[PDB]
Design an enzyme around this catalytic site. Structure first.
Site, PDB file in Angstrom:
ATOM      1  N   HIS A  44       0.805  -1.224   0.000  1.00 50.81           N
ATOM      2  CA  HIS A  44       0.000   0.000   0.000  1.00 50.81           C
ATOM      3  C   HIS A  44       0.837   1.271   0.000  1.00 50.81           C
ATOM      4  O   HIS A  44       0.341   2.345  -0.324  1.00 50.81           O
ATOM      5  CB  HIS A  44      -0.984   0.009   1.160  1.00 50.81           C
ATOM      6  CG  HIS A  44      -0.349   0.296   2.482  1.00 50.81           C
ATOM      7  ND1 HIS A  44      -0.174  -0.674   3.439  1.00 50.81           N
ATOM      8  CD2 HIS A  44       0.147   1.440   3.005  1.00 50.81           C
ATOM      9  CE1 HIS A  44       0.395  -0.139   4.505  1.00 50.81           C
ATOM     10  NE2 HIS A  44       0.606   1.142   4.264  1.00 50.81           N
ATOM     11  N   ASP A  93      -0.616  -7.650   1.521  1.00 48.21           N
ATOM     12  CA  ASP A  93      -0.035  -6.319   1.607  1.00 48.21           C
ATOM     13  C   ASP A  93       1.462  -6.490   1.804  1.00 48.21           C
ATOM     14  O   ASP A  93       1.985  -6.374   2.911  1.00 48.21           O
ATOM     15  CB  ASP A  93      -0.652  -5.539   2.756  1.00 48.21           C
ATOM     16  CG  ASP A  93      -0.303  -4.062   2.724  1.00 48.21           C
ATOM     17  OD1 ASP A  93       0.224  -3.550   1.703  1.00 48.21           O
ATOM     18  OD2 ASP A  93      -0.591  -3.389   3.731  1.00 48.21           O
ATOM     19  N   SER A 188       3.889   2.203   8.547  1.00 51.44           N
ATOM     20  CA  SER A 188       3.535   1.086   7.702  1.00 51.44           C
ATOM     21  C   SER A 188       4.717   0.689   6.828  1.00 51.44           C
ATOM     22  O   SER A 188       5.579   1.522   6.512  1.00 51.44           O
ATOM     23  CB  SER A 188       2.305   1.377   6.859  1.00 51.44           C
ATOM     24  OG  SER A 188       2.585   2.295   5.843  1.00 51.44           O
ATOM     25  N   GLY A 189       4.753  -0.598   6.499  1.00 53.49           N
ATOM     26  CA  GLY A 189       5.821  -1.195   5.708  1.00 53.49           C
ATOM     27  C   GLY A 189       6.987  -1.640   6.583  1.00 53.49           C
ATOM     28  O   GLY A 189       7.811  -2.436   6.152  1.00 53.49           O
TER      29      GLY A 189
HETATM   30  N1  LIG Z   1      -1.375  -0.542  13.531  1.00 56.89           N
HETATM   31  C1  LIG Z   1      -2.201   0.420  12.997  1.00 56.89           C
HETATM   32  N2  LIG Z   1      -3.109   0.861  13.928  1.00 56.89           N
HETATM   33  N3  LIG Z   1      -2.207   0.896  11.791  1.00 56.89           N
HETATM   34  C2  LIG Z   1      -1.161   0.377  10.910  1.00 56.89           C
HETATM   35  C3  LIG Z   1      -0.219   1.556  10.676  1.00 56.89           C
HETATM   36  C4  LIG Z   1      -0.853   2.799  10.051  1.00 56.89           C
HETATM   37  C5  LIG Z   1      -1.083   2.607   8.560  1.00 56.89           C
HETATM   38  N4  LIG Z   1      -1.076   3.856   7.813  1.00 56.89           N
HETATM   39  C6  LIG Z   1       0.104   4.463   7.412  1.00 56.89           C
HETATM   40  O1  LIG Z   1       1.182   4.259   7.950  1.00 56.89           O
HETATM   41  C7  LIG Z   1      -0.087   5.409   6.248  1.00 56.89           C
HETATM   42  C8  LIG Z   1      -0.094   4.587   4.965  1.00 56.89           C
HETATM   43  C9  LIG Z   1       0.412   5.386   3.808  1.00 56.89           C
HETATM   44  C10 LIG Z   1       1.578   5.013   3.175  1.00 56.89           C
HETATM   45  C11 LIG Z   1       2.052   5.752   2.112  1.00 56.89           C
HETATM   46  C12 LIG Z   1       1.363   6.859   1.668  1.00 56.89           C
HETATM   47  C13 LIG Z   1       0.198   7.240   2.302  1.00 56.89           C
HETATM   48  C14 LIG Z   1      -0.269   6.502   3.367  1.00 56.89           C
HETATM   49  N5  LIG Z   1       1.007   6.368   6.279  1.00 56.89           N
HETATM   50  C15 LIG Z   1       0.742   7.725   6.294  1.00 56.89           C
HETATM   51  O2  LIG Z   1      -0.391   8.197   6.417  1.00 56.89           O
HETATM   52  C16 LIG Z   1       1.878   8.640   6.081  1.00 56.89           C
HETATM   53  C17 LIG Z   1       3.048   8.197   5.479  1.00 56.89           C
HETATM   54  C18 LIG Z   1       4.082   9.090   5.282  1.00 56.89           C
HETATM   55  C19 LIG Z   1       3.951  10.407   5.674  1.00 56.89           C
HETATM   56  N6  LIG Z   1       4.999  11.311   5.468  1.00 56.89           N
HETATM   57  C20 LIG Z   1       4.962  12.643   5.825  1.00 56.89           C
HETATM   58  O3  LIG Z   1       5.886  13.426   5.635  1.00 56.89           O
HETATM   59  C21 LIG Z   1       3.710  13.119   6.468  1.00 56.89           C
HETATM   60  C22 LIG Z   1       2.707  12.250   6.657  1.00 56.89           C
HETATM   61  O4  LIG Z   1       1.528  12.632   7.243  1.00 56.89           O
HETATM   62  C23 LIG Z   1       2.790  10.851   6.269  1.00 56.89           C
HETATM   63  C24 LIG Z   1       1.751   9.960   6.469  1.00 56.89           C
END
Ligand SMILES: NC(N)=NCCCCNC(=O)[C@H](Cc1ccccc1)NC(=O)c1ccc2[nH]c(=O)cc(O)c2c1
Length: 236
Positions: A44, A93, A188-189
């Protein structure tokens, strides 16, 4: 990471920060070194990424402040996404990044072992999630790599907490009943790393969950042991 603490430099040497350069440079996702030319991460992360040319992988990083315009990085030659992947919540994923050059292993950067199919019966009691993600649902990317110890929960237990989803055997869950510690946005990742018999194994890839660190809402991770054949096939 919600409810975690700062990592020690070099204590998670398989952890990488994947950046995008578009429109300006920023952290995109975590990932794990699993081979000399190979990062394992979440599919993702590449939503809307049209080309590997905008990606930069940084290894041996504790603080994002270490990354400047003059900091060396690994280019990405190929993004390999699992062919059954549609979205994080429906599984598969998982993605591989083939690097343009090979990682020279050192105390700051080295691969994590993949789990053995023979370790499906193992009860991991020492599992950690790490990353530069938010420390609350509404936050920002952190400078210093964070860590949190989090207990695994059974799939049956996790399924009870996500009645609108199918928690499959290709997923694995971790969290406290009362919440408070979890991966969050930007993590994530990255790895869910479990220490067993003095060896670290890459048990999960941080994938999804409902908000971050909420009560009765464990984090959901890609169950890496279910993908060892795929990884071997794709890395040949
Ligand atoms: N365990 C739980 N409760 N959840 C699992 C973890 C959370 C998953 N979401 C995530 O981790 C997003 C997924 C994602 C990935 C790539 C692009 C867009 C979104 N990540 C993010 O929303 C994300 C990724 C990089 C970022 N860099 C920045 O400079 C500023 C941000 O606000 C930012 C936000």
């Amino acid at each position: 990471i919600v409810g975690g603490t700062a990592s020690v430099r070099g204590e998670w040497p398989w952890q990488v920060t994947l950046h995008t350069t578009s429109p300006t440079q920023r952290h995109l996702c975590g990932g794990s070194i699993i081979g000399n030319q190979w990062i394992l991460t979440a599919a993702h992360c590449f939503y809307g990424v049209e080309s590997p040319k905008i990606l930069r992988v940084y290894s041996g990083i504790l603080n994002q402040a270490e990354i400047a315009e003059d900091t060396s990085f690994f280019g990405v030659q190929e993004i390999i996404i699992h062919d059954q992947y549609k979205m994080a919540e429906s599984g598969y994923d998982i993605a591989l990044l083939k690097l343009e050059t090979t990682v020279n292993y050192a105390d700051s950067q080295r691969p994590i072992s993949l789990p053995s199919k023979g370790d499906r019966n193992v009860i991991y009691t020492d599992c950690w999630v790490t990353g530069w993600g938010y420390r609350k649902l509404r936050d920002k990317i952190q400078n210093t790599l964070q860590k949190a110890k989090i207990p695994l929960v059974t799939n049956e237990e996790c399924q009870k907490r996500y009645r609108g989803h199918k928690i499959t055997h290709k997923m694995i869950c971790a969290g406290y009943r009362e919440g408070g510690k979890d991966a969050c946005k930007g993590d994530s990742g990255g790895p869910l790393s479990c220490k067993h018999n003095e060896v670290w194994h890459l048990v999960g890839i941080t994938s999804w969950g409902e908000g971050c660190a909420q009560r009765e809402r464990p984090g959901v991770y890609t169950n890496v042991v279910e993908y060892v054949d795929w990884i071997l096939e794709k890395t040949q």
